[PDB]
Amino acid sequence: MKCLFYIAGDVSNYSIVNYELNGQTQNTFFAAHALYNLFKPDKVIALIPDSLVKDNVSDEECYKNLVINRAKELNFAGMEEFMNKVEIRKIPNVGIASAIQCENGAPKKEKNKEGREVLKRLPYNEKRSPIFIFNAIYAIFKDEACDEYLVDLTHGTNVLVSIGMNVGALFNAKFYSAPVMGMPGKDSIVNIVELTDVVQATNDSLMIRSSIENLDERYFKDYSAKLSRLNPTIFEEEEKKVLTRVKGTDVNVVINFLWNIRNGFTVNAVKSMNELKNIINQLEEDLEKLKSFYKNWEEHKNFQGETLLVLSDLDSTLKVKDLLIEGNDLEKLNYLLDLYIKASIYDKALSLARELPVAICLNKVGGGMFDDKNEKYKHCNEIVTSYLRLRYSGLMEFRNTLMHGGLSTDMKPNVDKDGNITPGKIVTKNKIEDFVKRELRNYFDKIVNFLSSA
Amino acid sequence: MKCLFYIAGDVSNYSIVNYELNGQTQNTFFAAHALYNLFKPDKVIALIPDSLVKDNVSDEECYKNLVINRAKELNFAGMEEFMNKVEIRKIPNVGIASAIQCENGAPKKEKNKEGREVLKRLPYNEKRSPIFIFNAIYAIFKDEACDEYLVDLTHGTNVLVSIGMNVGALFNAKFYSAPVMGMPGKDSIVNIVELTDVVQATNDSLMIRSSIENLDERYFKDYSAKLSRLNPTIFEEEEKKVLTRVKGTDVNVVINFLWNIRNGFTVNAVKSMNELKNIINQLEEDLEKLKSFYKNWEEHKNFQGETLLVLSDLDSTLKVKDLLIEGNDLEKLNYLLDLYIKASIYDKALSLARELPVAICLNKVGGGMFDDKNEKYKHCNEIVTSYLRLRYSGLMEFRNTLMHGGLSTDMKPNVDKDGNITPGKIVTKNKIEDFVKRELRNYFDKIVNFLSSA
C-alpha cells in the first residue's frame, strides 16, 4: 500500500499541461494529479500549509473545493476519484506568506473593479521553528503506516520542500518534482524529474566517509553494481578514456580490505595495502578529470541527463587513502595499530599490540614462522611475554579481558541454579578506554624500544 | 575561512526589507546580502542558474549587473563592493523556466506598450538529470576548500533547493532560507530560518537506526545533552507531565547497553536487558503522547518555537525494542547469539556460541562459578570441549581463527628477514561468512540438545 505525499500550494492560477515522467504522460493541471494517475497509490495525503486557506470551522474542506472550483474553470475531465479518495492534512509554514480567506467551505470572491478575484487577506506572519514543522511532518508520515511512500515536492515554499524532503528520506521515499517556473500556457510538455537518486546518493556518502573512519565494511554501500551498467549512448573518445577507466576502478578490493580489517586479518589487510595505492591513485586522477568535466559543464553534454555516475560516491571513497601508508609490512602493522585506536575498536588493538612486537623481533633475529615449532618465535614470544609481566602488568590483563568477554574464565561470572547470572567483575569501560586511547601506543613503543637492541 | 553560498534568482523585483536572524538585524533587499553582513564570510559564491540571465558573452556578468541595475532602482547603499567580492559560478537548471535576456553585460530592456521592462524570451526548456546538477554543484563545493560553509536557500527553485541542500550536507554546512512567498512591501520584518537543525536531525536518526541494526554504539548520536537544557518558558501543566518524563528518559543506559554488546560483556549486557524493557516502555507511551501533540498542533503552540526535542531522535531510539527478549539471563544470551549473526560480527558470535553451552550445563548441574577452581565448571568445560572435537571439529576451528587474527600461533605467517609477512592458514571471506550465518545456530542447538539430558 503506497501513499504519495505532496505540498499543496495555490492551484487557482495553474494551467492545463501534459506532465511527463518516463515515457508515460498524463494531461492534468498540477503535478500531484498527473503523478497520481501514473503510479496509482492506494491513498494520498495532501499536506496543505496555512499559507493558503483559513476560515472559521475547518479550512480543509475549502481546499477540496478550490480544486473543484478550478476543475470547472478549465472544464477538466472527471477527476472525481481524486477528490473523493484523498485525505487532506494541514501542516505549518513560516511567516511572510499571504493567506486566502474562505467563508464556509467555498473561497471568498471579491471585486477588483476590473475582474473577479479571490480575497487574500494576507494575514500570515508566523514565527515557527523548523524542527517544530519537522516534528509535525514526521507525525503525519509515521501514523499512516504505508509501505512504499513517494513524495512530490513540485508545489511547496522553499522552506517546506526543504523540511519535507528530510522527512521523506526516513521512509525509503522516492522524490519527484516538476520545475514549473512560470506559466507555459496550455500544453508545452514539462518534465517531472526523479530526485530520489540524489537523496539516496547523499546518505550513501555519509556512510562511506564514516565507514572509512570506523573501519566497518557493512557501511560501504556497494556502487559497483552502478558502474557496470554505466553506459551512456554517445560519449566522446576523451570521455571514453576517463569514463572507461572509472568503470574499471574495482571497488571490491576496498570492501575486502575493510572486511579483513574489521575481523582481524591484519596480514591480508597490510599485504593488500600497496595494491590500494594503485587503485585510489588511478581513482584520484580519474576523479580529477571527471571533477573537471562537471566543473565547466557548459557544453559538456552527453552526460547532461545520465542517471548513474555520482561524484560523491567517488570523492568519498578517496578518504580510504587515509588508511594507507607506504613502507614495509612490519611497519604497516605498526600503523594499523594506530588506526585501531583512532577508531575505537579495543579488542583488536590490544591483540595486535601484543602480537606485532613478536614479529618485529623475528625481523631483528632474521625471520621465522609464527608456530610453536619454530624456535626463533618460541623464544621471542617468551621475551615479549616476560618483559610484559615485568613492567607492564596492565597490557595483557586488558587484552585477555577483551578477547574472552564476560562469560569467560577471565570474568568469573556465577551461574545460579535458576538460569540467570551474577557477574563477579566490573566491566571497567573508562579504565579500558583511558588505557587503550592514552597508554597503549606508549607501552607498545617501550616494548619495541627494548627489543631493538637485540 | 568561511564561504556562504546562495542560489542566484531574479532580483529585479525584490524590495527592501528588514532581515532578522537571531536578534541581529540587517537591512538589504535580498537575503543573501543580509546574510553576508551577519556572518562576515571570507568569500561569497553566487551560483547563477540558467533559469535567469542569458546573454552572448558571459551570463555571469549580467547577473552582477542585474543586481546592480536593481541596486539603482532602489538606490541601495553598498552592494557594489559586495558584488565584486562575489565569485559568480554558473550552474544548471531543469526545464520550463523562462530566462531573462541580456545583451552586452546589461539586461535587454524592451517596450511593453505600457511600461519599460526587460525581455524575458521564455526559451528555457531542459531535460537534465538531477544528479547532473548535483555533480556540478558538488564540484563547486569541493574545489572551494572552505572550513565553515553556509548556504542560502532563500532564492532558488524547488528543484535546486532540493539538490543544493544535499550538496551542503556533505560539507557540514549551516543552511539558511527566508520564506519569500510574495512581496511584503517595504519593511515588514522577514525572518531568516535556520534549516541546519533539520538536516542534522535526520542524519542523526539514520545513524541511530543503523547503530542498533549493526550493534555498534559509536553511531548513536547522544541527544541527552539536548534534553538537559530542554525547558520551554511557558508550557501547560499537562505538557509539563509528559515533557518532564522525557528530560528524564535516561538514554545513557541504552548506549551502555550497545557498548557492552560490541565489546563482548554479554553478561552485563544481558543483566541490564530487563532494565531497558522498562525504559523503552516509558519512552514508547511517552512518544505516543508527544506524537499526538504534534497531531493537534493547531492550538498547542507552546512548542511553535522549541528547537530542542526532535521526534526523530526519540522514534528512532524505539528500534532497540528489537534487541530485547524477556526471560532469564541464560536464554537472553541465547538470543544475543542470534543478534551477533543478524549483524555480521562473527568472532563474538563464535566465542559466545562456545562458552554459553558451558553455562547452559551449569544451570542443569545446579550452578557454579566460571573459574578453574570450581570443579563443576572444570568438568562441564571438559565435556563440551571433548564433544566438540568429536562431532563439531569446525566450530572451535573457526572460533579460534577469529579470536586470534592474522599474526598468531593459529595463522602462521612467516615474517622474513626484510620486514614482510606471508600468510599461512588461508581462510577466505565466504568460508567464514557461510559458516556463522548458515551453520552455527544448528551446530549450537545440537550441542544444547545433547547437554539437555545431563
Author numbering:
A (entry chain D), B (entry chain C): 1 to 454
Task: Quote what the paper states about this structure.
Each dimer contains a cOA4 binding site at the vertex of the triangular assembly, and a catalytic pocket located 70 Å away inside the triangular oligomer along the two-fold dimer axis. We show that cOA4 binding activates a cooperative sequential catalytic response in a hexameric SisCsx1 complex and that the RNase activity is switched-off by Ring nucleases, which cleave cOA423.
To address that in the current study, we solved the atomic structures of SisCsx1 in its apo and cOA4 (cOA composed of 4 AMP units) bound forms. A SEC-MALLS analysis revealed that SisCsx1 is an oligomer of 300 kDa corresponding to a hexameric assembly. A cryoEM map of the complex at medium resolution was used as a model to solve the phase problem by molecular replacement in an apo SisCsx1 crystal belonging to the P21 space group. The α-helix spanning residues 375-391, establishes a series of contacts with the same segment in the adjacent monomer with the helices inversely oriented, and a well-conserved cysteine bridge (C361-C380) positions the hexamerization helix. The hydrophobic interface is flanked by several polar interactions.
